């Protein structure tokens with residue numbers, strides 16, 4: 001839909017992707033690609049970097065889950 | 070208010086409505102609220118036991134030093150062999166009875182209505198254990214006189230209680246250390262201080 | 276007298292160790308005048324050795340056939356000065372270190388860039404926390420009961 | 430606390446630092462290292478100077494007056510250096526503890542007065558008593574200021590406070606001078622003065 | 638020789654191939670990302686296995702991925 | 718200075734200060750209380 005499909009910009013989100021560095025770790029959604037053809041729109045910004053000194057990564061909608069806080 | 074040292078604001082997690090607060094929590098122990106409740110009940114019980122202790126030591130030593138009764142020194146008081154009973158029995162009896170007391174106090178602290186509702190038979194007395202408050206049980210068994218029938222609006226009485234009890238606890242620590250490095254009674258140390266105060270203190274112990 | 280070990284207050288080889296070390300330090304003492312700094316220091320080390328051996332005797336240490344104090348860790352009440360009382364003395368300090376460090380890391384956790392507070396140690400914050408580990412055996416117990424010691428996965 | 434951009438400074442021709450505006454009572458711009466570059470560091474060092482000054486003035490008096498009214502105005506004082514070896518009606522570690530317990534009270538009130546500017550003005554026993562001191566380091570109360578001289582115009586107060594710390598600075602210098610003298614020289618300070626006034630040349634720090 | 642694979646997590650930043658010193662990779666159009674391009678690996682025969690491609694893949698773990706496999710004279714990087 | 722104290726609070730400077738103080742503590746303890754193998758107080 002033209003309205004947002006994914007989490008809100010700023011919604012602290014958890015990663016269900018098993019192969020990511022931040023698995024079972026919280027994040028901070030900075031953007032969601034509203035194009036309904038990309039596979040991993042959810043641009044997250046974490047607090048601590050990965051082994052490649054990167055704090056951001058694209059994730060899917062099913063590979064993400066917002067916390068109750 | 071006056072919180073235990075001027076120039077410092079009291080912690081925001083304790084202020085005012087509590088028995089003798091004065092805002093002394095520099096080490097963040099009452100930061101969590103349920104921890105503070107548990108510690109309040111702990112403090113009250115500690116202070117009351119310590120008050121009974123200071124009375125039972127000062128009175129016995131007033132009788133001893135002056136020479137009214139030949140009671141033993143507080144230090145060497147546990148090994149008195151009683152004729153009718155033995156200490157080996159007394160420890161077990163204390164365990165039983167004070168268990169029935171303290172576990173009841175506990176199960177009231179976690180559930181205030183307990184010990185009075187249903188199947189809480191204590192010789193049919195399931196009404197004197199109403200509790201009315203944490204740390205202040207009330208009732209005909211525990212306050213027969215009932216000086217503070219109310220307990221929320223009894224801040225003067227609870228404040229007197231907790232202040233006298235903090236002081237009694239400090240005096241009990243005094244009894245513990247003062248009579249482990251001097252090996253006498255408190256009254257002996259006092260009259261040793263009141264003869265030559267500038268020559269008999271802690272640091273005059275070489 | 277346990278574990279086949281004689282006490283050091285009634286051991287022969289322990290006194291022999293004493294005599295041998297004293298003769299060793301006295302052999303190095305007949306090379307200087309008895310009032311100069313080397314001889315005074317050697318005599319001080321000699322008294323240090325003698326008091327050391329006598330203190331190991333009077334504490335009830337157990338000296339084996341080799342004549343050296345063998346510490347008992349099993350939990351014998353006579354030998355809690357060997358392991359259990361200094362063990363508690365250790366664990367109290369070690370948990371102090373851990374608890375002030377943990378409460379510090381939790382204190383800086385709500386910072387914009389917390390890592391700079393691990394490099395540039397916020398001495399006021401730590402110093403306000405540095406004595407908060409005095410009460411670690413009770414604060415940690417409550418944080419375990421309240422659920423604040425161990426983190427939750429989410 | 431009025432600034433004086435053209436005050437006389439410690440080192441004429443130099444530009445005094447920005448954090449010394451001239452406001453303080455006796456700030457001649459002497460801070461080369463920058464030990465008071467911060468505002469709160471300056472506020473702390475001010476009271477440190479004040480109390481070092483006052484303790485050093487009491488010290489200089491209790492050194493020289495017992496050493497002046499002993500060599501000429503004949504009295505009997507043991508010394509200022511070896512007075513800690515002398516004996517009194519109390520054990521040496523005991524009265525140290527007593528004066529610690531008694532001085533730490535006042536110094537804790539001072540700590541409170543520095544951290545919180547007005548917190549300790551009420552007498553905790555008799556709250557009708559008071560110290561009418563707005564300025565940190567200058568408690569205008571009865572026990573400290575009974576004669577009413579610590580009040581009035583801020584200019585007169587500033588000249589009086591710089592008079593105070595002016596006496597106190599050379600009091601500090603004099604006390605550590607007596608220290609280094611009684612160490613380097615054997616005899617006492619006023620005896621050192623008389624030996625200097627006998628022969629100013631062959632009586633100085635130099636002996637070789 | 639080596640088996641280079643590009644997974645669908647690629648953002649199309651063109652670092653994998655601008656780092657690759659042996660022309661193994663090449664960007665192609667795609668519809669799975671905002672950049673509308675993805676890397677492909679046709680010339681895997683020229684792949685030495687240096688993993689400069691996946692030392693420059695800015696994703697959760699990786700999108701480009703090099704699998705060490707049958708080593709030939711050109712994957713072993715031999716001038717002899 | 719604020720930045721000088723910021724540097725004194727850095728991990729190596731504060732570490733060597735802390736361990737110099739600590740080492741002096743343990744040193745003076747092992748000089749005042751040398752040769753210690755057993756805790757004899759309430760033994």
Ligand code: CLA
Pocket residue numbers: 439449453454455456457458459460463464465466471474475476477478481482598599601602605606
């Ligand atoms: C007790 C020491 C002490 C302290 C803390 C201060 C503090 C202060 N002074 Mg004062 N001052 C003192 C002694 C002291 N003074 C003495 C003795 C003199 C005369 C020599 C002066 C002369 C003076 C002038 C002329 C001025 C100040 C000013 C100031 C302020 C800014 C400078 C600063 O940050 O100082 C902080 C100082 C320290 C932290 C002390 C330094 C410590 C190091 C370790 C010294 C080591 C070297 C030293 C030379 C060895 C001493 C040997 C001795 C026997 C000679 C501050 C309030 C200025 C101001 O604003 O006035 C209000 C100003 O204009 N002071």
Ligand code: CLA
Pocket residue numbers: 599602603605606607609610613614620621622624625632633634635
């Ligand atoms: C109030 C400050 C003051 C005063 C009046 C004196 C006075 C004296 N000192 Mg002492 N002294 C002082 C501070 C002071 N000193 C300090 C801070 C130190 C430590 C560095 C010393 C260390 C010292 C030693 C080791 C010895 C003396 C000696 C002497 C005497 C002979 C002078 C001499 O040998 O030159 C040496 C003088 C100095 C090292 C002082 C340095 C300069 C000070 C800071 C000047 C004081 C400020 C001044 C009042 C204002 C400026 C004056 C002028 C520019 C207008 C004389 C009585 C000697 C003695 O006892 O012989 C009898 C001696 O052996 N002094």
Ligand code: CLA
Pocket residue numbers: 368742743746747750751752753754
């Ligand atoms: C991990 C293995 C290990 C162990 C267990 C020991 C154990 C010991 N060594 Mg060995 N040592 C080791 C490794 C080890 N060492 C290594 C690797 C080296 C080479 C670097 C040495 C080199 C060495 C030498 C050269 C010497 C020792 C000595 C000692 C003894 C130290 C006793 C002492 O002074 O403490 C006393 C306690 C302290 C210093 C700690 C004080 C802590 C403070 C006061 C805080 C506690 C108070 C606090 C406020 C709480 C109180 C309670 C209340 C307030 C709550 C002890 C038997 C000395 C000795 O006597 O040998 C027998 C000695 O001479 N060791």
Ligand SMILES: CC(/C=C/C=C(C)/C=C/[C@@]12O[C@]1(C)C[C@@H](O)CC2(C)C)=C\C=C\C=C(C)\C=C\C=C(C)\C=C\[C@@]12O[C@]1(C)C[C@@H](O)CC2(C)C
Pocket residue numbers: 459460461462463464480481482484485486487488489490491492508509510512513601602604605
């Ligand atoms: C407090 C004090 C003395 C107190 C003395 C007392 C109580 C004496 C008591 C007694 O005598 C009696 C009564 C009787 C005796 O029987 C016993 C004792 C007990 C002995 C001295 C301070 C003495 C303090 C002194 C000398 C301080 C000197 C500081 C200087 C020179 C600072 C310089 C700088 O800091 C600035 C100003 C600016 C920076 O930017 C640059 C630099 C250069 C770093």
Ligand SMILES: CC1=C(/C=C/C(C)=C/C=C/C(C)=C\C=C\C=C(C)\C=C\C=C(C)\C=C\C2=C(C)CCCC2(C)C)C(C)(C)CCC1
Pocket residue numbers: 348349350358359369370371372373374377411415424
């Ligand atoms: C008696 C003894 C013995 C034995 C013993 C034993 C056997 C024990 C065991 C024990 C055990 C089996 C234990 C366990 C534990 C577990 C756990 C799980 C824990 C946890 C903990 C925690 C978690 C903590 C934390 C902390 C602290 C508190 C400190 C610092 C900080 C921190 C945070 C780190 C012997 C004879 C040898 C000797 C003598 C002594």
Ligand code: SF4
Pocket residue numbers: 643646647648649650651652653654675676690693694695696700701
């Ligand atoms: S480096 Fe990775 S993310 Fe970037 S273009 Fe190549 S395959 Fe895609």
Ligand code: SF4
Pocket residue numbers: 641653656657658659660661662683684685686687688689690691703
């Ligand atoms: S391993 Fe080396 S040669 Fe192979 S694709 Fe990656 S960068 Fe190119």
